[PDB]
Nucleic acid binder design. Structure first.
Lengths: 140, 173, 120, 38
RNA sequence: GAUGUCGGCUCAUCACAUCCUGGGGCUGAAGCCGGUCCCAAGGGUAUGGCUGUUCGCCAUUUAAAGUGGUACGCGAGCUGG
RNA sequence: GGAGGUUGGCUUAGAAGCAGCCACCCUUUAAAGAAAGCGUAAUAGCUCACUAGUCGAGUCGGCCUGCGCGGAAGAUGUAAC
């Protein structure tokens, strides 16, 4: 039905009801938003609960949506370890106070390193480049 | 690769009445198809056909490909009936075949009464569908086009006759 | 009336006494206008007070002429003097009371008003 | 159509056909790429 | 050892680079209207005020009041502002 | 299939691969440019890239060069052999 990955969705972990983080972002996908929350309740307590969590969603018509085990997230938690909420007006060349590799060691101790990676070192190198979205360079 | 090298491999008891100048295929489920070729070389094997060519111009290299696909369509025609799926989109539209008359409702002031030309039959399983059964592609395809050009579709509503599903584009008002 | 610059009076109470034709409406160049046609008048001579002031482009219908109207017979009705009835922006009359006779030939889709106030 | 003196492709979907002695451009995408003569 | 110059009247004929009507791609074309560009020369293509005027500016129409060539058409056809 | 983080950020339902400016990385991984292009400008989706079959001989762009007017519409009649 809808077979291509990178289907983009940011609602909370356990909570699919807040639409103004995405709005009508799942209308032509086919499935209404309310029955997604049973899938968001299947992956809780690790995916930054309370805050809206971006998650790889896989669209099915069987009232169930399997998500990729991305155990600790990085689109918002790397903002927390750097010290910002809103990134710069042009990322990685305009700066607001960046993150280095000395502070990436503590957050990457909970990667569950074969679920978003293959080994433990390249998951640190994954969140090395996962800061390269929002005004945070790789400076070491 | 060229289509003129691949053979025909005519299936299941299809009879060739070849004179060299006018090939005549006669099979079951409809018969009496025939074509005339200008100048190619046709050999007649044990169940296949190969189309050799004469003088190596641009215009004999082009004929032997054309006359291969025309003979291949006559084989499938007595084997399988050619069909075209035409759907109707819009409120107040319908179609009903009455024997050999196909009469339509298209929101005009007077109803159109389209007549089918020859041994080719239009069946309507719905009010918004046409199925046109025949024996040759060019005559099935021509009749399906002339029905379509009564009310061609629309990018704003889609309100008009529309054949096999993937034809349409749209935009907003 | 029947030509540009034809002086003709009105048959109406609210109007002015005399008007003059300036344009025959209708086709490309209609040259004449019989009974029952729309012309366009200028007001040439007004009553000391009515409703319509002197020197104003209006619109009128022609109701009596000295050339006559001709029915499907030889029988013709032929008055003396020309006469018009002013209209509004929409073609409906301005006044209240119409003076003198009219013809029955004028009554149509849009002119059931003035044949009511006519008496013929 | 859009009569020019220099026709050329605009997107990846345009194919240039020489139909009956004239260089046409037909586009399987958006119709605003249809160009006639050149 | 002469080819009578501007505007008006009368009468016209051809071009198409189309004003109207006829067929039609695209549109930032919902419908009514339009904009723009290809095909088309068959028949049509305003009465007035002011000026010597063509031109123009106005008033009122109309389906529309086309742009050029023809000694800037036409005085052994008229007028003479 | 078509990426691991991951909604790629400020922004805006939405800017997410496809507001404006940009990151253009490192990595799950036969593969994946956090995108080349369409797609609801934008959400999908379709693809493209690139990898598994399928298919079983050629294929692809450019450089010079001979002959070919597409560009090319006018006023009496074909009317620049």
């Amino acid at each position: 039905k809808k077979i291509q990955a990178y289907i983009k969705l940011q609602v909370k972990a356990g909570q699919a009801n807040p639409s103004p983080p995405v709005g009508p972002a799942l209308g032509q996908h086919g499935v209404n938003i309310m029955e997604f929350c049973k899938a968001f309740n299947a992956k809780t307590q690790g995916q930054e609960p309370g805050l809206p969590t971006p998650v790889i969603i896989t669209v099915y018509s069987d009232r169930s949506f399997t998500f990729e085990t991305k155990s600790t997230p990085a689109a918002v938690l790397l903002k927390k370890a750097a010290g910002i909420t809103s990134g710069s007006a042009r990322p990685n060349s305009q700066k607001v106070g960046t993150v280095t590799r000395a502070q990436l060691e503590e957050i990457a101790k909970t990667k569950q390193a074969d679920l978003t990676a293959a080994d433990l070192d390249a998951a640190v190198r994954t969140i090395a480049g996962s800061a390269r979205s929002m005004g945070l360079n790789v400076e070491g | 690769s060229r289509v003129a090298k691949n053979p025909v491999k005519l299936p299941a008891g299809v009879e060739i009445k070849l004179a060299g100048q006018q090939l005549s295929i006669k099979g079951a489920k409809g018969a009496l198809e025939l074509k005339v070729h200008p100048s190619v070389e046709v050999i007649q094997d044990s169940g296949e056909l190969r189309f050799a060519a004469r003088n190596g111009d641009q215009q004999t290299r082009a004929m032997a490909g054309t006359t291969r696909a025309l003979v291949n369509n006559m084989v499938v025609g007595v084997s399988q009936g050619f069909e075209r799926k035409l759907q109707l989109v819009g409120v107040g539209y319908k179609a009903q075949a009455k024997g050999q008359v196909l009469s339509l409702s298209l929101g005009f002031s007077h109803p159109v009464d389209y007549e089918l030309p020859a041994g080719i039959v239009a069946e309507t399983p719905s009010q918004t569908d046409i199925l046109i059964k025949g024996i040759d592609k060019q005559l099935v395809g021509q009749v399906a086009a002339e029905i379509r050009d009564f009310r061609p579709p629309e990018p704003y509503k889609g309100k008009g006759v529309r054949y096999a599903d993937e034809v349409v584009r749209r935009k907003e008002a | 009336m029947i030509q540009t610059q034809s002086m003709l009076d009105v048959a109406d109470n609210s109007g002015a006494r005399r008007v003059m034709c300036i344009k025959v409406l209708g086709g490309s160049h209609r040259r004449y206008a019989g009974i029952g046609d729309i012309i366009k008048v200028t007001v040439k001579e007004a009553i000391p007070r009515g409703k319509v002031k002197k020197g104003q482009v209006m619109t009128a219908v022609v109701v009596r002429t000295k050339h006559g109207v001709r029915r499907t017979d030889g029988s013709i009705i032929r008055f003396d003097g020309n006469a018009a009835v002013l209209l509004n922006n929409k073609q409906e009359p301005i006044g209240t009371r119409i003076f003198g006779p009219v013809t029955r030939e004028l009554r149509t889709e849009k002119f059931m008003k003035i044949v009511s106030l006519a008496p013929e | 159509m859009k009569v020019r003196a220099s026709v050329k492709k605009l997107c990846r979907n345009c194919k240039i056909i020489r139909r009956d002695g004239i260089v046409r451009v037909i586009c399987s995408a958006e119709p605003r790429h249809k160009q006639r003569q050149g």
